[PDB]
Amino acid sequence: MKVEELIIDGFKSYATRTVITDWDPQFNAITGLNGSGKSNILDAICFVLGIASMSTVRASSLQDLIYKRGQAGVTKASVTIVFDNTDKSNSPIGFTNSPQISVTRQGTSKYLINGHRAPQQSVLQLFQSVQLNINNPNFLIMQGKITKVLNMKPSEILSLIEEAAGTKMFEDRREKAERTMSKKETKLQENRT
Amino acid sequence: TWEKVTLDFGNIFADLLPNSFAKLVPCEGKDVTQGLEVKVKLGNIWKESLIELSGGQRSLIALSLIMALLQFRPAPMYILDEVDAALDLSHTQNIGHLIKTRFKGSQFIVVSLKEGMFANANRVFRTRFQDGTSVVXXXXXXXX
């Protein structure tokens, strides 16, 4: 569940043409004079997943994800990712014999399962080897710009955040649905009697 | 669950912000179940809330609460949005020290807001830049 290398390309206003390595589990800082080449792969993950809370990624057409859609040299939405499974806990049943994987995605008509024409699901596997569950904001993606939103928060939202470990509202809604269903079905049982 | 979060709040606020720990005390004479507040402290002195804190020391308690929420579902990847403007470089170095001595197993990176900052970690991504994505029939007789 540890990223090894990230060699991606195909985006408009940032800085390609090298690979990053040595993704140690603890410390890989960010310091430079040009911000165009510091942490933009996170921005790439933003359009990979499609987080709609920030406007810097959502536009009229998605083709802004490519390097100027082709009028600058790169037409295909190229992204190459080599991911190795350091641990066996993030590997589901049937994926034990595939710790290392290399996925390329585009030629922006369709994606590539390891180089075979297929739908956009490939990118999911392209991030599957590091347990990056794209359903929830958790699983190494980020907590996000909520850093600047959680200021001046009352007690009720804090209690909600603390109960989010149990989600008592979810079970309460499920129990309310169960109660309505059981009322209707007990009326049906009375009709049957 | 509330006992665990209350016992965690103290150490979480104590380790990151030095000499200032708090407790998940209810708001106004109630129980933690139906109400809870925070008594933020400014280092050595003991004040009521984080309103008197600076911007950097406020982002510190913000990220401490973020880590308290994320510790239920951990993940070895952290991102900080270069909020060392109001804070000091030495305070951020101490924060990184506390991270590597408490948050072992968490890749810490920074998004570039103000260039030329956050050199507190051992490894750092340098600046090499070109075009697109960041990088370093007798029956009756018998019967009757």
Swiss-Prot record, chain B:
Domain of life: Eukaryota
Cell compartments where the protein resides: Nucleus; Cytoplasm; Chromosome
Paired cysteines (S-S): none
Physiological role: Central component of the condensin complex, a complex required for conversion of interphase chromatin into mitotic-like condense chromosomes. The condensin complex probably introduces positive supercoils into relaxed DNA in the presence of type I topoisomerases and converts nicked DNA into positive knotted forms in the presence of type II topoisomerases.
Subunit structure: Forms a heterodimer with SMC4. Component of the condensin complex, which contains the SMC2 and SMC4 heterodimer, and three non SMC subunits that probably regulate the complex: BRN1, YCS4 and YCG1/YCS5.
Family to which the UniProt record says this protein belongs: Belongs to the SMC family. SMC2 subfamily.
Extra remark beyond the main annotation: Present with 3290 molecules/cell in log phase SD medium.
Name of this chain's protein: Structural maintenance of chromosomes protein 2
Protein's organism: Saccharomyces cerevisiae (strain ATCC 204508 / S288c) (Baker's yeast)
Lineage: Eukaryota, Fungi, Dikarya, Ascomycota, Saccharomycotina
Gene coding for it: SMC2
